[PDB]
Write a protein that binds this ligand. Structure first.
Ligand SMILES: O=c1c(O)c(-c2cc(O)c(O)c(O)c2)oc2cc(O)ccc12
Ligand SMILES: O=c1c(O)c(-c2cc(O)c(O)c(O)c2)oc2cc(O)ccc12
Lengths: 303, 297
């Protein structure tokens, strides 16, 4: 009963967080097996930030120029390598707390948990979505770079996000764990445009299904709609187009509530065109798009 | 920057969660030192739920009637005791993962993180407030615990026992005392009229200012009493001087008098937000304490 925006249990990731210092810059790194991963801008000074040449900057660094601390333990750096926008520090000790893990790149609209850390130490954990424009609206103070986002299958941690920077708009941008940025962003201190953001339609629909599961049925109409009529409305209201793939993954929720996806779309259409008139759904006067269909099913019997 | 409803890192609590089975009822337990804590209704059968006599029910149980499994291993129960509404199952093995910990009873309006578990295993973690009526709007789960973390010490403040017929959740501290007027019986039970946690809304408005959302601010002022008259009308907790005092550090960092923020909240209550949002929400948010805002900002 009830419905919460829940994050993954963070213990498997807490045991991987280390502190990485180079020059005067300190940030968070991810220690898995015998490799520590961190944003490459750890090698930049305040005078490099405008247009750094990372290859030239890295060439002036040696293994002993990187201090990696795991709790009260210094790790010995026995090698360094740059892969896209992340730095990989080879250390002489494998992490005894290495969970089973994968590196994954996620699609826009997918969700993950973020373990916000500061100089190697966890501060908190929260659940968020990769925006359609490849940014995230997180909580990252100065010193948070290197904090990672993740999902957990059962005992396996799929790392999907590493935080690099806050854009001038206040939203956050980062890479997968191979150093490839989500979206058009580069790790330089220049103004950079994020694309026009949209609402994740399939997530709103999943969350309306969650509302029905919890008794909030007031928004349900028996009006119906075609997929393409709905998408015309979605475009007007800056919602992501709804595809058959989205309809397919909403299947299990359609079955449980006995509500055809297109009937739920017609009810969402009414919400988009008429508003909520001061009523709420699952305690919100706004339409929530940070629950995937999987998240909703998962909360209804998880672990 | 940015502002999220963040939960505490849950690792120190994950290592304390075990599975407790008695009869045919299985639920979550908390394993600290050589004691496993769990709701006492684990000893009830489906025929006892309506009006159990827990002393009589426990008297018919022995140590071998409690199955405590920590991951892949059974723990040996070498004694049992009932303290108010929780069982303490003495075991022959101290939890090697016991964090530094305290048991704390919290006040209404204070916040904590919940590690929602099912039959001993974590499902997720979320941040919530103890409602003024002592219920919790949260999400096999009985025995999951709520907690705060100071630095390396876990203050356990909550254990989940039951869902009320309204769907809200109720539970105890770790000495087994219920928050609120509730009893661990399967009967209809009223929770009091809930109110909004005023001092938390004010803290969150400070967080909004810190993150750039200043649009609700005015130089219109108010007394503590003029404000509280408004607060009562909109089902808001009355604002005390203690509340004004703990909002001090936020007032000092932002340059906004507490009463100025109160007057700004007064206008929000009387006029609504008129379709505008604060920190991405169209409703006034009351699950951040002044401390929560300060530690996150
Ligand atoms: O937004 C940025 C940022 O937060 C940091 C950062 C993060 C940390 O955690 C640190 O410790 C630190 O020194 C710097 O570096 C950047 C470098 C760029 O080239 C562009 C943008 C950023
Ligand atoms: O709401 C209640 C509830 O959820 C459970 C419960 C929880 C679990 O996690 C279990 O595994 C389990 O068997 C039972 O027991 C109750 C017992 C009462 O006397 C009154 C209310 C509840």
């Amino acid at each position: 009963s009830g419905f919460r925006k829940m994050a993954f249990p963070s213990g498997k990731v807490e045991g991987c967080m280390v502190q990485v210092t180079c020059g005067t810059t300190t940030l968070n790194g991810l220690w898995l097996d015998d490799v520590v991963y961190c944003p490459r801008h750890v090698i930049c000074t305040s005078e490099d930030m405008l247009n750094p040449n990372y290859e030239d900057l890295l060439i002036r660094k040696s293994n002993h120029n990187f201090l990696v601390q795991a709790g009260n333990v210094q790790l010995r750096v026995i090698g360094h390598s740059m892969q896209n926008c992340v730095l990989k520090l080879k250390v002489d000790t494998a992490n005894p707390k290495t969970p089973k893990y994968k590196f994954v790149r996620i699609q826009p609209g997918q969700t993950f948990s973020v373990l916000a850390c500061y100089n190697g130490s966890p501060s908190g954990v929260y659940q968020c979505a990769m925006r359609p424009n490849f940014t995230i609206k997180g909580s990252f103070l100065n010193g948070s770079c290197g904090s990672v986002g993740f999902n957990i299958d059962y005992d396996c941690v799929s790392f999907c996000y590493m935080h690099h920077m806050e854009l001038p708009t206040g939203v956050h941008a980062g890479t997968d764990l191979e150093g490839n940025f989500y979206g058009p962003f580069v790790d330089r201190q220049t103004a950079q445009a994020a694309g026009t953001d949209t609402t994740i339609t399939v997530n709103v629909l999943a969350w309306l299904y969650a509302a029905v599961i919890n008794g909030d049925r007031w928004f349900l109409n028996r009006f119906t709609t075609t997929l393409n009529d709905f998408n015309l409305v979605a475009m007007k209201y800056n919602y992501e187009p709804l595809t058959q793939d989205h309809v397919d993954i909403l299947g299990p929720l359609s079955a449980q509530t006995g509500i055809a996806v297109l009937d739920m779309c017609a009810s969402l259409k009414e919400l988009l065109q008429n508003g909520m008139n001061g009523r709420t759904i699952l305690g919100s006067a706004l339409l929530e798009d940070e629950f995937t269909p999987f998240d909703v099913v998962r909360q209804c019997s998880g672990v």
